[PDB]
Design a protein around this ligand. Structure first.
Ligand code: ADP
Ligand code: ADP
Ligand code: ADP
Lengths: 267, 236, 267, 236, 236, 267
């Protein structure tokens, strides 16, 4: 398949991609939230044939020593052997680690999940949010698909109302649910640089020939909460400038779909 | 403390009734074969690869393909979040699933190769190993792998004295026995048989028989899901 | 050694086995309890040249959250590299896991070790039983040899009398010992199916050519507390019926030896 | 709560000033190449091996050398002792360092081989990944490896509203953004770019630009450290 | 607090007396060689394989067999249950046992091969590494492996001021020094020497000498256990 | 490089070593303490081109159940892949384990770090000392270089004064520092036996051809606190006698350098 760099490269030169997308088009997007009923939150996301499932699970626990003020958020990506022949049984490899870390960071750094509004008793009892990413099919652009599924799944989440009883000192978990304090919708927008052209949402085939990849995660307030150039290759400042700008625009188109899918599920 | 409400079950089912079951083949681009199964509250994907290159020759068998199965539960699949990673349970189910699928496969046909089966439990509710074996045959059939039969699987149990078909979480948790069976229906060959619990011989045997009836029922859904697959390539 | 399937298969056809056993005979059995004095309980079991050592070790600890009513029982099988060339250094493989799990289950599910009679203080202090299986020589039928050694070693066990002092709130461990609440004697009986014949207690050589294997664990009250078909192959219902029946009869012959060895050691 | 004291920093530095930086090449007998860097309170060694024999052929690439980077922090390098062993952070930095150094290397020149880069952080203080990439190029250059350029690296950030050059621990901990950049200076090719924090587009971009200026400064120290190396073999 | 009761020991032994020692060769069907040792309260098996196929060629040595030793303690072997798995202690003893047995073996005789020695401590009581080395030579001799000598081993120590032979658990725990020695007796070549504790030079040296006398005693039991082996094949 | 045994062996026969050292000479020694300011203690040690860095880090924690009387000391050796091509990424191998264990033992068994003088509150709060060995370049004799760096780094250590407040029950950590209770200076002296000659401080090249190696760790009071024959080969009693004697003399020459480097750093 080194035959295929040449093909993809020459097609680009003629302004085309292998599946007839523009350089700024995403493949068809399917977002569906609420799909794992037993989870507190969930989302199934398809970027073309790329499929990822996120589950939100919450429990109550101790906060971290240094932040007794804050609830806990933790992101794990499983690159399941079933998703890809390049995925192997065992602990996260660096791909799984870097995707997890970048998706967490865009959320955390935007305070998209407001950890301060997750305290039950300061220093002792906080809500602990597990964002558990399950990659079901890898056909390109896990970064975006993952970040999409994760924020979509936070917004889907309904966690049980918890009450701290003052007379008893105890913490009552009520049957009534409520949303998580999700206050922003960060969305990663990823570009493949192949030669001298950047292309949004690369498929597998484009990732196999790209030089390098850059992810810009933006929210609806026009801020950036994560940038990650990944793999090899090099970018020009202006390609970086271009990517930042284009990302905000793709992020708003995607945020809108995230929002519909979120609402379609409370019906 | 009540599992038969006179003499129906908690979810309204009769002693020998199945939870609703939906299966679909060819759901993943990358696998050589796939199936998705919703069996009651269970949601499971099966992926197959390939026959593919086994590494290294050390692991290579000279006259045959080896079968490698990995059963795994997503952290969000269970009521209390599961840290990811195989545990002893998953290791054991992997092994017994392997043993359930091996007799159905003509391994001598692809020597020096591995056929990898991945069973991912996205939502669990009891019967995951049987729902997994059921979807793992469809997925093998999906990958164009030659097989002496499909492997159909179903569990019976004993709850509040009674032998019943296809436990849910509650009945399994609180019941007296769980008897998963897997069979190759055409010739009545049992490729999986486990019993967890406490049974008389005659209760064990009625359970084995009952689960074999539900496995035969599940077998007709497997054929139907495969028939559905060739109605979709017969376009056109 | 594929020469040897043919030989074993043809011998079976003529109603014979390689060591002149009947299809329902066990190889000579040696049970000896009390062999690791420093352990609370122990048993050395020989099924022919198959040798397994079980140790019982007990301590006091916390029960599991969900069962504050119950003492703790935990079963581990070490397939030591010394036992076999097929055994490797490292964490249990699936063979070690499946044997451990099946032997535990037959015991636990029969309540052969009564965990309720192992509480010191409900929810806080319970007895914790380690069943630690050490396979010394693998020559076939580890499943039976393991289950035999384990129940034999539970019955051998003498654990220190423990006292909860009410005035002090503390738990006194006395020098006086007592048996564990062992109320049943489950014994696994394992068959190899080789062709269309089932054979009890397969040797290594029979396991190397068998199609598949089925284990039925029964107690003295005529109940079954575990069934496990293992490896590949398929069984017929009637082969299953046959195995269940034969297992109860082999289990009683074995239970009797378990009992003698238990008594021979209190002299 | 004060990081610019009007409008100087805690350590006396101006918004676009560097911490003191000392680099030295060829500090280890055994590595094919090495560099030591003291960058503020950071003390980092980079070791390179070789191009060397890759094991096994499975891992071997047919037309090229593979680059393997391991970034690691000594337990004593951080204020609160770090248990040894990679963690998720280290795994990620390893990956991105790899990605920062790869474009600079002509891998097709040593096929079937591995070039191993070890970055050991002996004292950390913020900017370890950039100080590591800076010393890892000198070390590659030290091992006689052909390279399209050196890779120079530096971080910018935003603290108390302001875009600033080269955070220390305190400013990173308590600041608003940390933007490491790595470049191949001669052609202005960015081989590392990360942002952790919260920035407007125009703040992101000024940070990228600022860090590129400090990376170019660091690049002149790299050349100088290499010039120092050939003044030492020119004896005689 | 009393280890010499004037001037006998807790178990009745004199300063230079051995605990009872029983050894037997050829106790396992599957190993190429085996020995069982009861040395006081110690109960240890040694298994040997083979010279056997080393995997892969990477691990293969061209002119010789490699020796691989694994020393391990069963969980039930110690007063407080040991989680299974090597620990740092076991890793170290494995290494030093390896070093104790290597000089005795003519490795150049089986090139490209591994000789695997497994020492399993079923009951421990002090002196397990020496009882292990003693049974591991018998087991190597049992596997028909050519050897320049047997390796005999024994420990001395210092308890309550005094240099004594062959510590038990209590004396080791509470003593002042534990000096295991292993030797190839015929030529007086020390293949194991460790000291844990606090000794003067003259106390170290008397201990080394004392343990060498007990190792020579143990050597006569090894020969006797081997003589017993050839009285058993001389039937007939 | 089997060419090189012959060369080294023949040179020895003529009374010489490859770098012109006597059989009892060390390569040039560089000791420098205080080099990792953020650590509580540190030492960089060069035995020739062998380089090792030790860091001391302390915290407060629980003592071990059995020793509520004693502070905690823990020694870890990292054989970093950068140090050597024979070093690999992953958990300590047996080389790293055996070096760690031998260096700890010489210190612990001499009570060079007096653990009894590290208690804050008996049974509850003790000082915990991490000796963290970082091998930077392996060119022979890690054992000595490690033990040198470690004791040099203990003596360099300044840990914060801790106060137990009696009215409050709490433990105040003061800004004022103090040394650790270091009461002895054990130093390992290692010999390579190559043929029938023992040589102190072997280089890499000598380790590649030696038969075996013996380490004797002695302190300034004329006691031995660890002996370790390592690798293969065999020693004669008198070679052992010789090594013990020579070790005390090399240990005093080295102890003196340890002491200068310690003092040069309080200026
Ligand atoms: N680790 C776990 N955490 C929570 N629930 C679990 C876990 N493992 C299993 N369960 C629940 O118990 C059910 C029945 O278990 P079991 O009989 O062991 O497997 P199967 O799903 O094949 O019946 C599972 O489907 C699952 O719902
Ligand atoms: N595990 C750790 N423990 C304590 N401090 C740490 C740890 N990891 C990082 N730090 C501190 O935070 C600083 C900045 O972190 P970060 O931005 O993540 O990496 P970089 O060093 O590349 O800036 C590090 O240099 C270090 O001083
Ligand atoms: N992990 C452990 N748990 C409990 N006791 C142990 C453990 N390890 C060793 N011991 C006891 O200490 C004894 C002496 O220890 P040591 O000198 O370290 O080894 P050796 O057995 O060679 O003398 C051992 O035989 C054993 O009885």
């Amino acid at each position: 398949a080194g035959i295929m760099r040449d093909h993809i490269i020459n097609l680009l030169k003629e302004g085309k991609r292998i599946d007839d997308r523009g350089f700024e088009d995403y493949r068809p997007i399917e977002i569906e939230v609420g799909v794992i009923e037993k989870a507190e939150g969930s989302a199934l996301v398809k970027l073309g044939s790329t499929q990822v499932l996120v589950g939100i699970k919450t429990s109550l626990g101790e906060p971290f020593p240094d932040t007794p003020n804050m609830g806990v958020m933790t992101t794990n990506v499983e690159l399941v052997p079933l998703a890809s022949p390049t995925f192997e049984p065992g602990p996260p490899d660096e791909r799984a680690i870097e995707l997890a870390r970048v998706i967490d960071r865009g959320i955390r750094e935007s305070k998209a999940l407001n950890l301060e509004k997750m305290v039950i008793v300061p220093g002792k009892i906080v809500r602990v949010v597990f964002i558990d990413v399950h990659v079901l099919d890898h056909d390109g652009n896990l970064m975006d698909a993952i970040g999409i599924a994760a924020i979509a799944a936070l917004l889907n989440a309904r966690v049980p109302k918890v009450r701290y009883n003052e007379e008893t000192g105890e913490v009552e978990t009520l049957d009534e649910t409520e949303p998580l304090p999700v206050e922003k919708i960060p969305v990663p927008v990823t570009f493949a640089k192949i030669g001298n052209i950047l292309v949004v949402d690369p498929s597998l085939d484009e990732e196999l020939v790209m030089d390098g990849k850059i992810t810009i995660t933006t929210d609806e307030t026009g801020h950036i909460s994560a940038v990650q150039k990944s793999e090899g290759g090099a970018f020009k400042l202006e390609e970086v400038m271009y990517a930042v700008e284009t990302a905000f625009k793709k992020a708003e188109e995607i945020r809108k779909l995230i929002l519909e899918a979120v609402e379609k599920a409370k019906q | 403390k009540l599992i038969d409400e006179n003499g129906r079950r908690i979810d309204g089912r009769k002693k020998y009734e199945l939870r609703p079951i939906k299966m679909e083949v060819g759901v993943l681009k990358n696998a050589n074969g796939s199936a998705y199964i919703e069996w009651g509250k269970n949601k499971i994907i099966a992926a197959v690869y390939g026959p593919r290159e086994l590494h290294p020759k050390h692991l290579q068998r000279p006259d045959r393909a080896i079968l490698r199965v990995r059963y795994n539960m997503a952290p969000f699949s269970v009521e209390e979040r599961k840290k990811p990673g195989p545990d002893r349970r998953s290791i054991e189910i992997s092994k017994v699933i392997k043993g359930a699928l091996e007799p159905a496969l003509i391994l001598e046909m692809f020597p020096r190769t591995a056929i990898d089966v991945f069973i991912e439990v996205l939502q669990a509710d009891a019967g995951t190993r049987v729902a997994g074996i059921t979807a793992a045959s469809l997925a093998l059939a999906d990958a164009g792998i030659p097989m002496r039969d499909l492997v159909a699987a179903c569990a019976a149990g004993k709850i509040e004295g009674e032998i019943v078909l296809d436990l849910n979480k509650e009945e399994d948790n609180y019941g007296e026995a769980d008897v998963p069976v897997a069979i190759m229906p055409l010739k009545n060959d049992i490729t999986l048989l486990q019993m967890d619990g406490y049974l008389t011989k005659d209760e064990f045997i009625e359970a084995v028989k009952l689960a074999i009836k539900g496995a035969k029922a599940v077998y007709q859904k497997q054929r139907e899901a495969l028939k559905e697959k060739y109605l979709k390539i017969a376009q056109e």
